[PDB]
Amino acid sequence: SADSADNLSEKLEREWDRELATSKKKPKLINALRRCFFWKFMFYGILLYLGEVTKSVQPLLLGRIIASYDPDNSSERSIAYYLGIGLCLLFLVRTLLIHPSIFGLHHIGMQIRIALFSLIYKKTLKLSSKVLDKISTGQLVSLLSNNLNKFDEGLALAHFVWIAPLQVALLMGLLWDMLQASAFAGLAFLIVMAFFQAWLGQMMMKYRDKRAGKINERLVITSEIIENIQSVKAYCWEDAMEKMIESLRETELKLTRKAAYVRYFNSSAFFFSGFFVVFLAVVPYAVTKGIILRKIFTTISFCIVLRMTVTRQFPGSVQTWYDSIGAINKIQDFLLKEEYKALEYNLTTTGVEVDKVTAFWDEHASPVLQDINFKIEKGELLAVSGSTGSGKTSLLMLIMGELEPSEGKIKHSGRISFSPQVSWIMPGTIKENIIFGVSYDEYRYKSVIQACQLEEDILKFPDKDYTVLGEGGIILSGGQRARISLARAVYKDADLYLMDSPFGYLDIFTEKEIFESCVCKLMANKTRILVTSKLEHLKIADKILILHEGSCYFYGTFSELQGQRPDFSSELMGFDSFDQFSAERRNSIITETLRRFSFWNTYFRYITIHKSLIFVLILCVTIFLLEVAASLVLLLFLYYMIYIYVGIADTLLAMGIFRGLPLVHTLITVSKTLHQKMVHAVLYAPMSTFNSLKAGGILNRFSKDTAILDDLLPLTVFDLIQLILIVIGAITVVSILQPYIFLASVPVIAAFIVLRAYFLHTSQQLKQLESEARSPIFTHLVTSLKGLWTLRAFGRQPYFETLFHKALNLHTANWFLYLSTLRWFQMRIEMIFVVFFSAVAFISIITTGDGPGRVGIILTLAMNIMGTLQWAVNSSIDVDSLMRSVSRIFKFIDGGQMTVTDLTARYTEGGTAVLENISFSISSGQTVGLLGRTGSGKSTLLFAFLRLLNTEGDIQIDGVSWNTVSLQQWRKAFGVIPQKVFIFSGTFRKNLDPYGQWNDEEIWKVAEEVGLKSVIEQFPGQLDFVLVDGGCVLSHGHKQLMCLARSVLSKAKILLLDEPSAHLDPITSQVIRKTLKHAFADCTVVLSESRLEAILECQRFLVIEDNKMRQYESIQKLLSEKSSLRQ
Ligand SMILES: Nc1ncnc2c1ncn2[C@@H]1O[C@H](COP(=O)(O)OP(=O)(O)OP(=O)(O)O)[C@@H](O)[C@H]1O
Ligand SMILES: Nc1ncnc2c1ncn2[C@@H]1O[C@H](COP(=O)(O)OP(=O)(O)OP(=O)(O)O)[C@@H](O)[C@H]1O
């Protein structure tokens, strides 16, 4: 196998294609994979087997070593000495064999994951356009992310399904004194515990899935709040929002608490089983014959090995193996989906023809285009219009071959250049997008960018042609993005050009210039098809096509339309000034014209009250499980003293469990408190200070830190308690029996501490790389999916495959490094442990072990100490991560005449002053407003009034200086409607009144007053209607009216309007102006405008530039100076 994506793909594709081609009904992905996998997998598998079997040998060697100190036979020092050497070698050898093999398995898992990803990517780019709208988008994201961190770890246990029965059979077969079947007592106990654990694990999954659903809801409201803190503060909404968070948090905790108990009992159950396999193991020796230390010590070590292989190594592989298979099956179902069918290029014609085409998207379709017919000569212009939905753009999909005809033929000449309705951002170099995938030629480039009028904006870009367009399109306005899409489509040399919604939401002036510049001259003699709403274009076009309800309304000469459907023409012409109508209005006019011219309970309470009932219930479970094991013991079918001793053991264990329950209670309480305090601290935060994170780390830390406290503190703590108790016992006993062991062990622990610290520093830093390399694989994917229509249209598939592979290679390189440092670390750790082991074995062997039982116990304690120690290493790693998270959390918590005198503002106490020494007066009830350049800090006056900025000077409102008024009332006076309006998701009643202070009747009265009564009536449920996704169903004008309704209910006196005109068409802007003037007849209205025509209705003006201002008492004084200063 290969170490790179290109090679891994070739191999997978060859086997997959060969089997898929060998069409034995249902070819399978799993077979293509086993043919790659098997010849490496099996070798690491056998090596691990050979490694693990060592554990089944080591106890035998100790039994003989122990025997050498017996009074029997002779004190053969030399034998004890050499056998001791052999034992320490067994530790060393398995260490040296096992770790390399585990590493190799992870290497394999990685290689397979990469091959699978490249296969999927290649497939998504070849999918049929029909199934494209049936496959949920969330499924492709999860198809790749769901097993991202699972598949490659899972192979580590895969060969255990195979190993487990070999070691179980051996350990069973090695039992000494086998017929007195202590074997069944042992196995019956372990078997019952294993099923118990499986059941409990299933309950854990139930809780995880339900909780996950609630988490997503909490996170959505959380990000909504975080990105709009200024509106929450401006509204003085505050704690109502805090309460919304509280109810979501409370819901999650109820589920979490139950999940926590599942985890608690799982861990104590594990402990319980440890005790009993050892305890049951000595029941034979108490029962008749008596004790032989030689055999007892041997017996216990074997019992320990069975516990672990039986309860943990086996079922882990079973669960892993099964889930992995299910993941593969899902991938296969995805791969086996209908393809995009390639278009066959030919030299049949020069024009475009359509012969009786009838077609539809899917089965059960009524949107069948009927009897479509064309004959277009080379170089002719076709203009198409029609009702929205009557195949306005679906026709283009037929032309390009995305949609097949059910009947008829489509003939075309050569290659097609296509520009879609919705621009594809293509993050990257702007010149490169214009000429993407083609050679640069300045002759053509200049001609196209000049003709398309790009120079007007692109020459203002800081790196010109090399200005990079980043994510979000922060460089370009929607009309500019459209302009680039045209330039790209034009730059490409094609025989046929298809222009989807070419008007581009552009100003009519440029729209005309582009049509003549491009449609007529730049595109001269090309065959063209334009989608259009302008009658002038139809007049210009050689052929006119109008569609309605899936069929042709009219096809022919412009004058033929007028001669054959004159009433249609006359009605449209009544709106003679069509160039003055936006596309939306042009669309409504044709839609209407065209359709018009149609042509238990008592005790439950006591159980909560009496903790003594809780104790009994704990004991009852313990009794039950032992009795079940007895049922299996009774297999022998085909005493009072034993009964007493086992009863005693159960009682003691039950009390031990009962004692620790308050810890679970405490853990849930603590994370609840921390979540609540962080939220409070963020809401009542200073402004400017939060700009250190700018919502990035705020959302990410808020979300992630809470999640880790809840899943790990309640888990890692219990493992630590058990591990701690074990080591205390182990050290205490050897220290007493032989003080030289202590002397020897002190430097051993020191060695581990130092290595650990070094390791964690570096590995914690490397971990950052997974996220850095991982994020872009998804950004790449999404971009490719949105661009699918053009990726095929222009033949760019291999370009993108190349980019995808480079991203994968980056990711795997970092992933691999992380894995490698971890493995090295673990190997070093194990070798240190191996060395102290050898030394300890010899301390015992060497000293005067004349009371041999003491020799035996030191040796078995040391031999079996390694299991616990491996857990301890990993637990220490988790602890350090938890403490780092705790610190990150802790870091956050441990006047009618408005009179403004000498006002100054900054974005921080350092920084820059955005406004200095401004003085300004507003007469009571006076309509006033502001003029200034875009980016002159207009919003910083509004924020200075809202007290969101570092500020100086004296503002007198409601008769007093701001200096004597707290933020809530100071802000209360100001009813502000920002350009970016915040919409709270949820029921309209709450969106408008989050406190429940207004009555429904009152709410309706205001809805009527502000013109939203018809809007709320239209939405089902009215006040009970739930508004979603930021008001995705509302006009932004409506959002402004909602804000208005809030302002009037709130009884604000100062009304602040942030350029409503920035987005609202005058046809409605005047309606809201009338509405608010009546609503605010007794109030003072302050407007920030972009144009003189709007500012014109004001009596006093504030004109701001360069952190200074000129006050005018009349528009004429403003105009006289503005003319002199019109620059
Ligand atoms: N691949 C598809 N499968 C099924 N239905 C589709 C598919 N693509 C679009 N549609 C729908 O069927 C019709 C397709 O026609 P077309 O896309 O030409 O309409 P349009 O008038 O261009 O759409 P609009 O102007 O509303 O964006 C639309 O009314 C749309 O709702
Ligand atoms: N709190 C802030 N910290 C840092 N920079 C800011 C802050 N507030 C605004 N800015 C920036 O400084 C200027 C502030 O002016 P303002 O926010 O009034 O601009 P605008 O003309 O309203 O811009 P837009 O049209 O994008 O809304 C802008 O050009 C913006 O880029």
CATH no. for residue 1035? 3.40.50.300
Task: Specify the ligand 2 atom closest to the Cα of 941.
Answer: 18
Cα–Cα dist 484/431, whole Å? 10
Kindly list the distances between the CA atom of residue 792 and the CA atoms of 290, 377, 400, 419, 798, in Å, as whole numbers in the listed order.
83, 26, 10, 12, 10
Cα–Cα dist 573/535, whole Å? 9
Report which DSSP code applies to 242. Answer: H
Q: Is 907 in the pocket of ligand 2 (CB under 6 A)?
A: yes
- Residue 350: HSE in the Cβ half-sphere, 13 Å Cα cutoff: 6
Cα–Cα dist 211/376, whole Å? 61
Cα–Cα dist 728/513, whole Å? 86
CA of 937 to the centre of ligand 2 (A): 6
What technique was this entry resolved by?
cryo-EM
**Hey, what are 627's tokens?**
């009795």
Residues in the chain whose C lies over 2.5 Å from the next residue's N (breaks after): 599, 638, 894
Long-range interactions of 543-547: CB distance < 8 A, separation 24+:
543/376, 543/380, 543/381, 543/382, 543/383, 544/383, 545/382, 545/383, 545/384, 545/385, 545/386, 546/384, 546/385, 546/386, 546/594, 547/384, 547/385, 547/386, 547/387, 547/390, 547/391, 547/392, 547/395
Atom 20, ligand 1: residue with shortest CA distance: 389
CB atoms within 10 A of CB 828: 14
Most distant pair of Cα atoms in the chain: their distance: 126
The alpha carbon of 77 is separated from its chain's Cα centroid by a whole number of angstroms, namely 65
Pairing of strands 986-987, 1026-1027: antiparallel
- Is residue 981 one of the residues assigned to a domain? yes
Q: Is 939 in the pocket of ligand 2 (CB under 6 A)?
A: yes
CB of 358 closer than 8 Å to CB of 371: yes
Q: Which residues contact 893 (CB under 8 A, 6 or more apart)?
A: 677, 678, 681
Report which DSSP code applies to 517. Answer: I
Which ranges constitute the DSSP H helices of 336-415?
394-399
Cα–Cα dist 848/434, whole Å? 88
Residue corresponding to tokens 């195949």: 391
Helix (H) or strand (E) holding 1104: strand 1100-1105
Pairing of strands 1084-1088, 898-906: unpaired
- Is residue 755 one of the residues assigned to a domain? no
In sequence order, the β-bridge partners of residue 1109 are: 1104
Sign of the C-alpha dihedral, residues 995, 999, 1000, 1002? negative
Q: Which residues contact 55 (CB under 8 A, 6 or more apart)?
A: 94, 167, 305
Q: Which residues contact 1082 (CB under 8 A, 6 or more apart)?
A: 925
Atom 8, ligand 1: residue with shortest CA distance: 394
CA of 938 to the centre of ligand 2 (A): 8
Kindly list the distances between the CA atom of residue 862 and the CA atoms of 67, 87, 838, in Å, as whole numbers in the listed order.
17, 11, 9
Residue corresponding to tokens 């246990």: 157
DSSP string, 321-349: HHHHHHHHHHHHHHHSSPBPPPP---SS-
Cα–Cα dist 298/61, whole Å? 9
Task: Specify the ligand 2 atom closest to the Cα of 1088.
Answer: 22
- Phi and psi angles of residue 505, each rounded to the nearest 5 degrees, phi first: 55, 35
Report which DSSP code applies to 312. Answer: I
- Is residue 51 one of the residues assigned to a domain? no
Q: Is 937 in the pocket of ligand 2 (CB under 6 A)?
A: yes
Residues near ligand 1 with C-beta < 6 Å? 129, 133, 361-362, 367, 388-389, 391-394
Sign of the C-alpha dihedral, residues 605, 607, 611, 612? positive
Cα–Cα dist 268/217, whole Å? 33
- Is residue 738 one of the residues assigned to a domain? no
Q: Is 943 in the pocket of ligand 2 (CB under 6 A)?
A: no
Q: Summarize the chain as % helix, strand, coil (round to 5).
A: 65, 10, 25
CB atoms within 10 A of CB 924: 12
Report which DSSP code applies to 1106. Answer: T
Cα–Cα dist 978/1058, whole Å? 5
Helix (H) or strand (E) holding 529: strand 527-531
The alpha carbon of 164 is separated from its chain's Cα centroid by a whole number of angstroms, namely 38
Angle between helices 58-67 and 853-863 (to 10 degrees): 160
Q: Which of residues 599, 626, 648 is at a domain's end? A: 599
Cα–Cα dist 504/521, whole Å? 19
Kindly list the distances between the CA atom of residue 839 and the CA atoms of 62, 731, 913, in Å, as whole numbers in the listed order.
16, 15, 71
CB atoms within 10 A of CB 507: 10
DSSP string, 888-935: HHHHHH---SEEEEEEEEESSSSS-EEEEEEEEEE-TT--EEEEE-TT
Cα–Cα dist 746/152, whole Å? 38
CB of 940 closer than 8 Å to CB of 688: no
Atom 2, ligand 1: residue with shortest CA distance: 361
Q: Which of residues 599, 621, 652 is at a domain's end? A: 599
CB of 162 closer than 8 Å to CB of 45: yes
Whose CA is closest to 924, among 1039, 1085, 1071?
1085
Cα–Cα dist 344/339, whole Å? 15
Sign of the C-alpha dihedral, residues 89, 94, 99, 104? positive
- Residue 164: HSE in the Cβ half-sphere, 13 Å Cα cutoff: 17
CB of 316 closer than 8 Å to CB of 150: no
CA of 386 to the centre of ligand 1 (A): 13
Whose CA is closest to 351, among 398, 289, 413?
413
Q: Which listed ligand is nearest to 1058 at the C-alpha? A: 2
Task: Specify the ligand 1 atom closest to the Cα of 394.
Answer: 18
CA of 404 to the centre of ligand 1 (A): 15
- Is residue 789 one of the residues assigned to a domain? no
CA of 908 to the centre of ligand 2 (A): 14
- Is residue 361 one of the residues assigned to a domain? yes
List, in sequence order, every beta strand (DSSP E) within 596-730: none
Cα–Cα dist 1069/1022, whole Å? 25
Pocket test for ligand 1, best of 131, 363, 392 (most atoms within 8 A of CB): 392
Within the chain, how many helices (H) and strands (E) appear? Answer: 43, 23
- Is residue 944 one of the residues assigned to a domain? yes
CB of 394 closer than 8 Å to CB of 369: yes
Whose CA is closest to 844, among 834, 859, 832, 833?
859
Atom 19, ligand 2: residue with shortest CA distance: 935
**Hey, what are 827's tokens?**
């190997």
Q: Which listed ligand is nearest to 394 at the C-alpha? A: 1
Q: Which residues contact 16 (CB under 8 A, 6 or more apart)?
A: 29, 32, 119
CB atoms within 10 A of CB 160: 24
Whose CA is closest to 907, among 945, 866, 950?
950
Kindly list the distances between the CA atom of residue 555 and the CA atoms of 545, 548, 567, 596, 854, in Å, as whole numbers in the listed order.
5, 12, 16, 19, 105
Cα–Cα dist 116/518, whole Å? 45
CB of 1003 closer than 8 Å to CB of 1023: yes
299: left (phi over 0), alpha (psi -120 to 50) or beta: alpha
CA of 387 to the centre of ligand 1 (A): 11
DSSP string, 263-311: HHHHHHHHHHHHHHHHHHHTHHHHTTT---HHHHHHHHHHHHHHHHIII
Full domain range(s) for residue 1039 = 898-1124
Q: Which of residues 561, 578, 599 is at a domain's end? A: 599
Domain tally for the chain? 2
CA dihedral 760, 762, 764, 768 (to 10 degrees): -170
- Is residue 405 one of the residues assigned to a domain? yes
Q: Which residues contact 528 (CB under 8 A, 6 or more apart)?
A: 380, 381, 382, 496, 497, 499, 519
Cα–Cα dist 1037/920, whole Å? 30
Residue corresponding to tokens 């009993």: 276
CB of 56 closer than 8 Å to CB of 305: yes
CB atoms within 10 A of CB 888: 12
835: left (phi over 0), alpha (psi -120 to 50) or beta: alpha
List, in sequence order, every beta strand (DSSP E) within 331-484: 352-359, 369-376, 381-386, 407-412, 416-419, 428-429, 468-469
Angle between helices 239-281 and 293-308 (to 10 degrees): 150
Pocket test for ligand 2, best of 908, 912, 914, 1090 (most atoms within 8 A of CB): 914
In sequence order, the β-bridge partners of residue 546 are: 385, 554
Atom 13, ligand 1: residue with shortest CA distance: 389
CA of 130 to the centre of ligand 1 (A): 12
Kindly list the distances between the CA atom of residue 732 and the CA atoms of 156, 429, 861, in Å, as whole numbers in the listed order.
36, 68, 12
What is the resolution in angstroms? 4.3
CA of 1043 to the centre of ligand 2 (A): 22
**Hey, what are 919's tokens?**
């003085």
CB of 982 closer than 8 Å to CB of 231: yes
Q: Which residues contact 604 (CB under 8 A, 6 or more apart)?
A: none
Q: Which listed ligand is nearest to 914 at the C-alpha? A: 2
Report which DSSP code applies to 506. Answer: -
**Hey, what are 905's tokens?**
């503002």
CA dihedral 67, 68, 69, 75 (to 10 degrees): 150
Kindly list the distances between the CA atom of residue 475 and the CA atoms of 21, 446, 470, 472, in Å, as whole numbers in the listed order.
48, 21, 7, 9
Cα–Cα dist 1035/1041, whole Å? 10
